[PDB]
Structure formats: C-alpha cells, structure tokens
Symmetry: C4
Subunit: 386 residues, 4 copies
Amino acid sequence: DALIVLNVSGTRFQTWQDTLERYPDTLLGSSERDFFYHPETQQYFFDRDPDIFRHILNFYRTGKLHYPRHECISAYDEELAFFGLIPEIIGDCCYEEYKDRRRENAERLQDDADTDTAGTARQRVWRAFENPHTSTMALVFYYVTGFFIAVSVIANVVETVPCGSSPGHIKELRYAVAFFCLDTACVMIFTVEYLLRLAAAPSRYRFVRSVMSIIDVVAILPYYIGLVMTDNEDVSGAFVTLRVFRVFRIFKFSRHSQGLRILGYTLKSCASELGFLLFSLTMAIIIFATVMFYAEKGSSASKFTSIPAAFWYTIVTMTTLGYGDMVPKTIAGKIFGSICSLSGVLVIALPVPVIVSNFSRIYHQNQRADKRRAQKKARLARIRAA
Amino acid sequence: DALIVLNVSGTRFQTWQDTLERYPDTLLGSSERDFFYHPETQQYFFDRDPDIFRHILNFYRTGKLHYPRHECISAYDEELAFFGLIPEIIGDCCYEEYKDRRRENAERLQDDADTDTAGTARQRVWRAFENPHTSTMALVFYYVTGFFIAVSVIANVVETVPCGSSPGHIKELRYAVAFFCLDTACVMIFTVEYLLRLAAAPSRYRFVRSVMSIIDVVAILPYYIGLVMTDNEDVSGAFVTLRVFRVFRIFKFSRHSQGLRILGYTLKSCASELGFLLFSLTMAIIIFATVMFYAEKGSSASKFTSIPAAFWYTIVTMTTLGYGDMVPKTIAGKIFGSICSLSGVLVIALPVPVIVSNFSRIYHQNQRADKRRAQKKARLARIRAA
Amino acid sequence: DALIVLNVSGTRFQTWQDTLERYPDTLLGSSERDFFYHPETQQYFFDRDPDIFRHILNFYRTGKLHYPRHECISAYDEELAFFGLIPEIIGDCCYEEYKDRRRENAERLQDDADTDTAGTARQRVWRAFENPHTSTMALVFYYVTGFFIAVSVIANVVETVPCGSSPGHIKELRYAVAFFCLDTACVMIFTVEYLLRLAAAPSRYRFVRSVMSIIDVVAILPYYIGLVMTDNEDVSGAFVTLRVFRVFRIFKFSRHSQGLRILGYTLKSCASELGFLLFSLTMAIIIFATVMFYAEKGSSASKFTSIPAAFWYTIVTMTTLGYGDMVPKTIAGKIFGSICSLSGVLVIALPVPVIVSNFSRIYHQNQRADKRRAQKKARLARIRAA
Amino acid sequence: DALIVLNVSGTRFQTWQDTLERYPDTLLGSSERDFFYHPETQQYFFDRDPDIFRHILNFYRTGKLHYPRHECISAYDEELAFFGLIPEIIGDCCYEEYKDRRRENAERLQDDADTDTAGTARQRVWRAFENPHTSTMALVFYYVTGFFIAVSVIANVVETVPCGSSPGHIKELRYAVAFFCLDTACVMIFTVEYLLRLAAAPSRYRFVRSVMSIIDVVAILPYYIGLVMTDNEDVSGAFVTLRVFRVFRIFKFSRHSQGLRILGYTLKSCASELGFLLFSLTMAIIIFATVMFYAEKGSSASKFTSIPAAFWYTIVTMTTLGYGDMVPKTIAGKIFGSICSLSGVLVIALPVPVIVSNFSRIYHQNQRADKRRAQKKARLARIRAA
Ligand SMILES: [Zn+2]
Ligand SMILES: [Zn+2]
Ligand SMILES: [Zn+2]
Ligand SMILES: [Zn+2]
C-alpha cells in the first residue's frame, strides 16, 4: 500500500509493509512492531545503532543476511538477538568469517575462564609447589630440587670418565662409594618430594595419571629395582638398562622450563604431522635402501650386505650427515644416492613448517595471555584510581 | 535545470538530471527512472541499501566506479545487476581486489558443487572401496589389503638378510620356498582386488587411465613377467630389475594416506618450480664439476679423473653431505668447493619456499573444506531445530 | 554568528562560518564557497560523495586531516584536489599508509606504462629474436641456438671422459678431431647469432653494454684467443684457463629461462644482503680459524699447520659439510668446532630469509603482471561484446 | 518522558533523556549538555564527526563501548577526551586492538622523539667520529681506522703461514721484526683513537661502560700485557692466549657495519630464546651421549670411551656434520644415531624462526625509520614550496 518509517536513533529508515512482514517470527515481523508505534509521528523508534540495523533491513529485503567485517561481533550479535534473529542464517560467504571472529573472541572468553579460578591446611603446601613465587620456602624447595637434579645428572655423566670413577691403570689403587652415596641422596630427595606431592595432591588419580608423576616415578624407580636385584648378584645385562634409565632425571626440568612444556604441547598438537613424517620417512628409506642394495650388491668388498644394512646408508644420506663409512661405488648407486639426499631433504622439510608454525603460535599464545593479564591488572588499577 | 531526489530506503540522495542521464543503458538512465517516480513526493524510492548506492551514484558522477573493500561481494554485484551495471567497468585499481574476492567466493562455490554430488547393484560395491567408512565389510577389505601390502613389503626387505633367506655358511643346510609362497599369496590378493575394482568401475577408461590403476598394475605385473621368464631359465640380469620393481607395492598406501595424495597434488602444482630446480641444479653441477676437475686434475692420485667423476663431488658438496671420499687438495679446488657448498645451498633453497607454501595451502584447503562441511551440517541441524 | 548548511549530495552537513573560513587558500575557504550558494535554500550543493567530505570537514575543524583505510585512494585524492587540498597535509599517522597505497597503485601505473609501449625492415628481425612467439622462423632460431648451446655443453663435458676422447691405453690407436670440428661449428653459430643481434640492435651502445651481450662475447672469445695462441705453440698453462672458460656457454640459457633472469634480478636487489653475508662469513671464518689453529697447533701430526690451513676446516664445518679430512683432536678444538658449526649455521641463515622473500616477491610480481595482462584483455573483449 | 535531539554536524541523533543521563561524570551527562542547548531549535549542536559519536552514543546506551577498526586512533581518542570519556572503559574484545594501534602509533612517537634531538669546541670533534658523513676529516679518520683494523687482521693471519713468518727450513736464514713493528703501529693508532674518543666523550662513565669501549680496550690491552710480561722472559703458556686474543680487533668493524649492530640487537632481544636453545641442546646432548655410550661401550676398538667422549659424536650428529671419525657399529647405536640426527635438527630449528623474525623486524624498523625521515624531509620541502 504505502511505506512506513521505522527510524533508528537519528538516522531514518523507511520500507514497505509487505517486506517487513515477510518473517513474523522476528521482533519486527510481529506485534512488537506495533508496540514501538509512536503517536502523531508514526515512527518506530528503536534505541539501537543504525549500522547493524542496515544489515537487518537488508536481511528483511532479500532472503540473505550478510556480516560487516569492520564491526564488533558483540554489537552484531546483540543486535541480532534484540531483533529476534539467529546467527545461523547469516549467509555462507559471510558465515565463515563470522565463525572465525566468534572463535577468536571465545579464545579470550575461555582465557578469562581459566584466569578467574585463582581463588586450607594441607592443600596450602600443594599451592606451594604449584606456583614457585607464591611463597619463599616453596621457592627454596624449587631451587633445591633443581640443584639436586643437576648434580644427579652431572654425577651420572662423570661416573663414566676414566680416572674419575673408572680406572685406566692395572694394579694401582679408582672406584668410588661416594658416587653410590650421592645417588642414594639424590633418590632420597626425589622420592621425598614425589611423596609430598602425592600426599598434598587434591586428587590422587588425576595426579598419578599425569605425565609429570609418571616421569618422576620412572626416574626414581630404577634405583629401587637395582637395590632389589642386588640380592640376585651383580651380573651384567639389565644393569646396562638400569644405568641408561638414570638419564630420565633430566626430564624433571619441565617444571623449571616453560619452553619444555610448550614443546610438549606443540608435539601433542602435531601428532598427525609427526605420524606422516614417520610414515613418509620409513617409506622413502625402504625404497632407497632396496634400490641402493641392489645397485651396490655386486661390488668387491661392499658394505651393502642387505637392505637392513642399506637402511643405515639411506638414513645417513637423507639427513645430509654423510659419515662416509658407506659410500656407493657404482654409477647407479651414485645416481640414486644423489637423488636420495634431495628426497630426504624434501621429506624432512615437509612437516617442519607446520611444527614451526604450531610452536610459534603456542609461544605467541603464551605471551598474549601474560600481556592480557598484565594489561587487565593495569586497567583495573586505572579504573580504580578514578 | 534543478536537482531531483532519488532517495534509497531511509537515507536521501539528490543529484542533477544531466549527470543521472549520462548513461541511458542502465536502469537509472532509462524510463525505469520515471517508473519509480512517486506522486506528491517526487522521490524515486529504491528498496535497496544506501552504501552500495553511494558507489553507484559516484560512478554516475564520474566515469569511474570503485569497489568498497569492507563489503560483501554478493550484495555488491546484486546491486550492480539490479541497477543495470556490469562488473567489467569497476575501474582497475579496485578491479583486482574485486577479482580476488570473486575467486575466493567461487572457491567455496565449486566446493559446494563438489559436495552436493553425494547422491544400484554392482556400483554399490564400488561405493564400498571408495570411502572406507561407508560400510563394515568395506573397512575389512581396506584393512586386509593394507596388512597384505605391509607384509609383502616386510617380506621383500627380510628376504635379503643373511641367515633369514640368504645362507652365510658354505655346506650346511638357508633358502625358503615359503617366501615364494608368501609372494604368490600377496600377488593373488593384489590382483583379485585390482580385478574387482576394474569390474566395479563405472568407467573402465577413466579407471584404467588413472594413476592408482597404473600404480597397481606396475606393482602386480613383475610377478607375472617373472613367472613367464622362468620358462627361459633363471639367468641373472633382468632378475635384479624384477626384484627392484617389487618395492613399488609400497606406493599403494596412497589410498590409506591422505598426506601422500596431498604431496602428489602439491608436486603436480609445482611442476614448473621442480623443473627450474632441476635445471639450475644441473647447470650449477656442470659448472662446478668442470672447475673442480680442471683445478684437481694434476694431483698425485686424485679421484677427479673426469668431469663426470667430478659430478659426484659436486652433488655431494652442494647438498652438504660431505662423505669425504673425494676432497680437493689444491688451493683453487678448496676455494671452489667452499663456493660450491654455499651455491648449492642457495640453489636447493630457491624453490623449497614455494613447495612449502603450496603444500601448506593445500593442507589448509583440506582442513577448511572438512570444517566447512562439519559446520554446514551443524548449521542445518540447528536451523532444523527451530 | 550562526551555522550554515553545506550539504553534499543527499546527506546534509552544517558548520559555523568561522571554522569554514580558517583556511582561505582552499576552495571552500574562498569565494568558491559563495559561488555554490543556492537561492531560497541557502545550501551549498556539492555533487561529490559524503564519505570523503566527512574527512575534509574534519580537517576544517581541527588542524589535522586523516585518511580512511577502507576507501579508494583515487577517489580520496580526487576529492582532495577538487576541494583545493594537498596530499602533504594529511597528518603523519595516516600519511605512511597513504604513501603505501599510493606506491601500490603507482606500481600498476608503471606496469601499464611498460605494457602500452608494444607498438620497419631491419628492426623487424630484431623483433624476431626478442619475443620467441612473435613468428615461426624466430622460434626456429630460438630452438636451434638452444640445441647448439646444449650440444656444446655436452661435448665439453664428454671431452674429458676416458675412452671417449682421452686414451687410457699406452700404445693402441683415442683423440678426436671431431670434437674440434664440433667446437668450430658451435662457435660459428654462436658468433653468427651474436653478429646478427648486434646488427639488428636499434642501439649499438645499449646492446653492447648489456649483460647478455658481454656474456655472449665472453663465451665466444676463448675460441678465438685459442686459435690466435696456437701460433705460439700448444704449451700448457693458460690452456687450462681457456678450457675452463668454455663452460660459460651454459649462461646463454637465461634467454630461454625466465627463472634465471628472476634469480639475477633478486641477486641484484639483495646486493647489500649478500655483501653483509660475505662480510660476516669471512669475519667468523677468520675468528674460528685463528682459534682452531691455536688450539690444534701442538698435536702429533695435525693438519692445522696455519690459519690459512684452518680456513678450510672452518668453511667445511660452518656449512655443515663435515668431510672429516681435518678433525680437531683436543678438547678445546672440539668445543670450538662444536660452537663453529652452530655459528656458521646462524651466519648462513641470517640473509637467506631476505633472499627468499625477495625471490618470492619478484616471482609474485611476474605472475601478477601476466594475470593482469590476461584479465585486462578479457575485460576489453567483454566490454567490446557489449 | 520524550526524546531529545543532540545532532552532530549534519547528521542528526535523537535519544531518550534517561539513557543520556546514566553517567553524569562525562560531558554529555552533566550541565555541559544544557550548555549546548540552542534556542528555538532544541538541538545540541556538537561540531565533531558523527562516526565516533555513533560509538559514543552506543556506549551511552549499553554499558559497553567498542572501537571501530577502520578509524584513526588520534580522532578516536580526541573524541573520547572531548566528550569526557576514558580509553580504559572500551570493552575488552576491542581493547586489545586499540592497544595494538596505540603502541604502533607510539612507536612513531618515540621515533620522532629520537629524531628531534639532532641539535661547542671539544664535543665538536666528538660529533666528528659519531656520524661519519658530518665532516670530511672525520671520514678520513673513519677510513684510516678501518684500513688499520684490516691490515692488523691480515698481518695476524699471515704471521702463521710457513715461509711468510715461520721457517720451514732447518739451518737457512725466516722470522720478521717487521711484524712486531706493524703490530706496534696498529696498537698505536688504536690506542690514540680510543684515547681521543675517551677525551671527547661528554660522559666518561657512559662511554667507558659502553660495549664498544670495552671491545676496544680488550682489543688493545693484550699488546700492553705482552710487553709487561716480556720482562718475565718469553716462556710459552699464556703467550698462546695473548696471540689468540688479538683476533678481537675484527670486532671493531661494528662501527663500520650497521648489520653487525642489528645482529647484536637481535641477539640481545632473543636472549630467552638463545637460553632455551642452549638448555634444550645440552639436555638432548646429555641424553643421546649417554645412550650412545652405553650402546657402543662394548665394541672392539670403539672410540666411545666415556659419555664426555660421546658428547663429540652427539654434537657432530645433531648438527648434521658427520665427520665420520666416530660412527656407531652396533644396531642400537645406529638406531639411536639416526634418531639423534633428526632430534638435533628439530632442536636447532626450534628458535631459528624466532631469531629470523626478530632480525627481519629490526631490519624493517631500520628501513622504515630511514624512509620516514626521508619522506618527512620531502614533505617539509613540499609544504615550504607552497
Ligand atoms: Zn555475504
Ligand atoms: Zn579505485
Ligand atoms: Zn591519523
Ligand atoms: Zn567489542
């Protein structure tokens, strides 16, 4: 029939009734439209902003609703909810960018959700060795356990040097019981700290099933297995394995290193990429080892005695090591080793970009989170000052 | 003469008649302008959005039409078509960004075109081994053929180890007919699966000409060539080639690996880059091999006996392998090897960025496509719930 | 006193006279403002767009003029010029982005300036061997000269292989005059082609001073120097240099390779980066060679006989070659070689990102230029069809 | 009760009194609102821009204030201050981007603060050797000291070559006092230049504590220590250390090289990243050396005599050097070396992206600063020409 004016605050909008009444489910398609009617002015006064109302009216005109890139999603979805609209009908070309903006905002939302849980006898000491700067004695425990881990690692390394603990002489007086005593002490502090952590843990199951607890137990257990086995003499064999397993104490530094935890998280995130790396690596290794073995099988004194023996050459060449203990001597072997070097470079460089990008993005998340916390504290102080 | 008002819904626009009538081909330059004339108000009421109409009026003023970056191209070209305008007259400085936006949208358009073709006796089994999760027995076939490929590869590798199938003794009782039996079995399942795929293929030509079919046939054929040739005795020579060709069975994993297909696609896309890599690599190799041969020709017992013999040194040095079996002994040879290492590093690193970028963009396309499918399903469910 | 309305087409603007008259140099601060005055409406009707006029009025209010990022610079500076404003007074925070947009547009401007010069007896043949697809016989010359370059390179490589041109026997009948004849032929075609290019060159100075002409002459001249020197017997010495210089014929492929020209351009652009690479490389080499020599000087039979002799070890280690012909034997030497490997990796990786970025940006310029040409042709055809 | 109109210049805005009076602290919530009241028009005329006033009114409606991305922050915070608002209440989703824009602008602010301090007997000569292009004799001093550094480095390198300064003969007449004289001269110019710099330095403490002064003193002092020690005979020992320390004179080129200073700054900025690199590197080295030693301990004549002896193999393998003087001979050793190569590649490549990004961003800062200075000079000249 005619056109009605439905002005937003300040800027006026006018449209035909039939277009406005196409969708009766929304606020503007129902009796709420008649509710906003004003006397002697016939203007539907909405106390909102006109920019989003432009898109709302555009959605009313066509069957398509868009999303302006240069706008705040909070205001956008506030105007959507206020006008009885849903975020699931905003086209498809604009829908993906809207989802990207929503996920970027939700990242901050769950960051604040993790922040606000900051906050009783026993668990107090659990709060001690959970943030090293909460107290002074907790920091003392932190530094003491770090020093003990370091001294244990250093002693384990030094135990094998000649004239330090292994004699190079024949009949002269150089072992040390002091190394055993130092190992006993280090294991004592390690197990005491682990037992205190287990006792102070609010949830025994969550603590025990955690990666750090299993790392601690696999670091401390070898000493106990060794003392148990000493009842069955000191025969070699598994003794070498027990000696090897003592290097796992260096993994306890992940409490003292944020970078170690970031690297663990970025290795967890790229599990598919590392799996593809391993699969393509072993596929290329098998192919090139087979080709190299069959090319170098019939030499004078070739070290390519089998495909498993060619695995060594293939892995040395693909990583661009080039020890030189196994080199091809035939034309075909040389050609295929030349191809193998470049192909291994390509295989290795395939997922390194993804690993780098994930590590960089996690690192940037860490700095963005700490910067957000600091700036939020500063803003709270500034707004409290006024 | 005067100015006429041609207001879009809400916001008014006014302009002189002569400017509006410069182009009679469009909607607003013809009798359609008089059609929209309203009585007692002399306002041309267009039920569109004002933002794009601003650019339309700007095009009417000058001979130049721009494109706003902060807008939806669907709305933009809808307003262009509605007002009798063409997308081929939107300047040149804004034209390229418009084309970029159009191609980004068209990417989603053909993605939906590939999605909507999801969807009868024989071809049903073809649908079995085309998406492994469609049925339960199809997944059984998938895992069975994967296991058989793996066991064939493992047997081919193990066949060459001493004391496994090759005797290291002289007169003691170690070959195995069991290896031949396992090869017969693996080829049996491989050819049965390939024959079933060929029979169930809707188009025999498209299936046979495909890369996967030719890979399967070149993997299975060597056994048949070998059995045919056994009628002509078991003389060596091509027997080594037949043994080598058996490693191609590992290429059948590209059905089981999305990463292998992505790598194949990104190698296809970068064909020019790989060609340039090969050309620059061989050019540098020829140059440096010539220089190194002429610098190291007159040593005591130099292994630089010819330029082809210096190809080996050049390719080892350019890839930073450094076996050490061929090292320069003269000052000129050392200088040119030092230059050769860095130059080869540069040559290799020239197209690796492009290969990395293409692989990353294809990978991102894969995740964006699967995310779009999942979010479209979720949006359909949500809109069905209301 | 009061406020005057100075409405742009459609949207109205009102401001006080004193603010509008602050700058009399501009169009709106002078009698042109009174020129636009309309009767019985007191509205200064400007037939422009309101968005840029908002920034113009903002500049009139304060002493600061901004630049909207979401706008076309062509429209922006058109409104600046139309209103008597200059682009040199648009603040400083917005000035840099304005300059970036202007340079991005000017890049297309000079691209079109290079395009529009596409376009007589002699110079016609110069147009033959300047774009290979202009004619059919020019393409024949292109392929013929490419084949001759390739055969010359292949002959130069093969001339040094034993039993091909160098006898490995003692008294049996294997030199070849055919190699000399092939060299004569290749030099004949090379010099004929170069002479034709020089004759057909519109500017002899520009052609001769060009890099391609000097490459061609240094490739062809060694044969003439050799024939001249043959009058002074065939004594060795410079004969090796003449043989070496024959490999420069492979540089003529830069006509046939766009990638070679792109690499040359990106090496020219990064001259400062390559200079810094060389400087830091030689600095690190000197430092580490001195340290390694003084650490390894007093070994049993060390090959570290001098700092120049340690240059070889340092350059081998810094590039991660590791030949193994020179390895440190002392603790200090091992520590400093371990540091040297990582430091050389860092030094090499310092400017590789810049070289990669420059090569990628030049490559992207090439594709963007060809895409722009193709899309401009398509747009011209489409606009001619209507 | 009713709605009041509070129009900004041109575009009108209307709102209810209760919403406008929610916050009395601001300009519009106090008697300043009544101050702007106009007679016979009841319009609050604000001579500002409407775009930011839209966000101001939106903040008045809700309890949330947003920030438009497509706007100048100078105008934004000018409108915030003019209307009695604070930048600390602009939400949180828009707050972070606002802070990013503020820091980007402040970067230019402190760049201009460092620029404007450009600007008396003694200190004049200090201005001589602080910017080499200020005068002509200062440039002469710059080139003279560069030449003397270069000749000192060259002499130090050449002093160790056989037959140059070290005799290879037995009884024939080849040392040189000329090398000592050249060293005396170089130290003379070095100490004269350093003394002049110290005398002309406005602040002796700031100059002495600087890195360049300590570099100069550690470069010049070894000669004086040597002349002092010559009174205690010429016994070896520390003589080698004094000879080694003479290579530090090459560090004086950082005055002559902007890239050296940029590299120093980017190493200072990435101190945490280099610390993490060192920590992860030594952790991996310890782990892999322990495993390799225990795997290769029981070979025939293995060089894996201890974990410290396996440090050499681990660091050679992790950097992909591969000298080949120590190679594993057992299956376990080969497997763990194969893992070690890839793991070392990962460890090395972890912080190289961050180092590259920091160096690139510092380099881009340098070019952006010099470009800004040049364009500011050009703009000043252009505005002076009008
Ligand atoms: Zn859209
Ligand atoms: Zn434009
Ligand atoms: Zn600005
Ligand atoms: Zn917001």
